[PDB]
Amino acid sequence: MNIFEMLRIDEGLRLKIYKDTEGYYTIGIGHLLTKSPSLNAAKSELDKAIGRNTNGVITKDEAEKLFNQDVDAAVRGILRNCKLKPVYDSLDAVRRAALINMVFQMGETGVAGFTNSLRMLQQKRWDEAAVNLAKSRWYNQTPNRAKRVITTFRTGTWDAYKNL
Ligand SMILES: *SCC1=CC(C)(C)N(O)C1(C)C
Ligand SMILES: [Cl-]
Ligand SMILES: [Cl-]
Ligand SMILES: [Cl-]
Numbered sequence: 001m002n003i004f005e006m007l008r009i010d011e012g013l014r015l016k017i018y019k020d021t022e023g024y025y026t027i028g029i030g031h032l033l034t035k036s037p038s039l040n041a042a043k044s045e046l047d048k049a050i051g052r053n054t055n056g057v058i059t060k061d062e063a064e065k066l067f068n069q070d071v072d073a074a075v076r077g078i079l080r081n082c083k084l085k086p087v088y089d090s091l092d093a094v095r096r097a098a099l100i101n102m103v104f105q106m107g108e109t110g111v112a113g114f115t116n117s118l119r120m121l122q123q124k125r126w127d128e129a130a131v132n133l134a135k136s137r138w139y140n141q142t143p144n145r146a147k148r149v150i151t152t153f154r155t156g157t158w159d160a161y162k163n164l
């Protein structure tokens with residue numbers, strides 16, 4: 001298991017434009033296109049992202065390219081953020097993956113907002129961090145995925161992702 005396999009499980013793979021859990025146009029492995037309710041706006045973002053006239057459909061290779069860029073962006077974002085960087089640096093490789101997962105799903109600014117959870121993670125108070133993380137819109141709206149990510153922070157193992 002690694003961050004790519006982890007996010008591939010959590011995000012799935014779809015080669016045509018679809019709506020994500022929030023109802024936003026997305027494609028590939030959780031590549032958000034736009035929050036606009038306009039499909040045409042989403043198709044324009046897609047064409048721009050891929051570099052060709054796609055008409056809403058991409059190849060597996062193209063999906064994987066966006067995915068690589070997005071994972072890279074999530075990590076880069078953590079390292080540039082003054083709230084996220086110290087937490088990330090303090091963590092082991094497995095828990096680092098859990099933090100990248102959150103950033104991929106909700107964005108740098110969103111995760112940076114979890115001030116109390118971040119402090120508990122920095123303190124290595126794993127059970128306490130896990131309890132705090134669950135008190136969130138994130139957990140309530142995507143409880144199965146949140147549970148997996150939280151288990152990863154609690155245990156520092158891939159237990160929530162094996163057999164998946
Ligand atoms: S405080 C984190 C941080 C972000 C960035 C602007 C990339 N930096 O140069 C430092 C390490 C200060
Ligand atoms: Cl709490
Ligand atoms: Cl709550
Ligand atoms: Cl879920």
